[PDB]
Design a protein around this ligand. Structure first.
Ligand SMILES: *[C@@H]1O[C@H](CO)[C@@H](O[C@@H]2O[C@H](CO)[C@@H](O)[C@H](O)[C@H]2NC(C)=O)[C@H](O)[C@H]1NC(C)=O
Lengths: 110, 116
């Protein structure tokens, strides 16, 4: 029917407290044979997960694919957030052009 | 033009200088080969990304993009190669190879495709 779309509310910008776990949720409809990646949009950008695999720091990130009521929520958890985790996080679908949703994480220290 | 190449190559994050080519000139319609070095005997995985849009091109030994012109392979024990089979002028720009190692190594390559 339709190409892949990222549905509201995805990649919500947030301020978290030092040490909290933070979820970024990418709700994807009509994914079909496409795939989803999560990236930290720093300079340079950093790959966090691709398809159903976490790429680095296995105890730092958790990926839960296709959850929620409609089996369409992709949730990346960043555990124990630090000042270094501040910045922009993007969910990307490998359409051409890519389909992106981005949210900014702030982390407040005591 | 010099600033564009510098803005790309400044994105390298490495313990030792990149040993491979980081500026690649090719003629449109020809293939391009971008190299990513990994330590001997390590078992790291690598990912290639296009900086202009942030598109993930390959990750591990799999192509991620659906653009059929890209393939990743292990050229030798210490070298991964991103092969672009039919370059076009619009492919020019910055590409990054990220390694999942402890220091989170990133190598940057600038590709210039010349259009006759
Ligand atoms: C995250 O991305 C936002 C944009 O979506 C960045 O905010 C912008 O910051 C630049 C300077 O870095 C300004 O020129 C823009 O006007 C800002 N736009 C908005 C909408 O705020 C933000 O800096 C990024 N965070 C990082 C890189 O840590």
């Amino acid at each position: 029917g339709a190409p892949p779309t990222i549905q509201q509310p995805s990649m919500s910008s947030a301020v978290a407290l030092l040490g909290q776990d933070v979820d970024f949720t990418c709700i994807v409809n009509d994914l079909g044979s496409h795939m989803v990646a999560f990236v930290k949009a720093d300079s340079p950008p950093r790959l966090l997960s691709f398809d159903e695999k976490v790429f680095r720091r296995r105890n730092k990130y958790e990926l839960k694919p296709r959850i929620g009521d409609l089996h369409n929520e992709w949730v990346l958890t960043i555990k124990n957030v630090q000042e270094s985790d501040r910045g922009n996080y993007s969910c990307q679908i490998n359409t051409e052009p890519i389909t992106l949703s981005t949210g900014e994480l702030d982390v407040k220290v005591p | 033009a010099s600033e564009e190449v510098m803005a790309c190559l400044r994105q390298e994050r490495s313990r030792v200088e990149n040993p491979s080519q980081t500026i690649v000139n090719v003629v449109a319609e020809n293939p391009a080969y971008l190299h990513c070095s990994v330590p001997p005997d390590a078992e790291h995985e690598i990912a290639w990304t296009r900086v202009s849009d942030g598109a993930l091109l390959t990750a591990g030994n799999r192509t991620f993009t659906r653009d059929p012109r890209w393939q990743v392979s292990k050229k030798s024990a210490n070298i991964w190669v991103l092969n672009l089979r039919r370059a076009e002028q619009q492919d020019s720009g910055c590409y990054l190879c990220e390694i999942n190692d402890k220091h989170n190594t990133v190598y940057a390559v600038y590709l210039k495709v010349l259009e006759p």
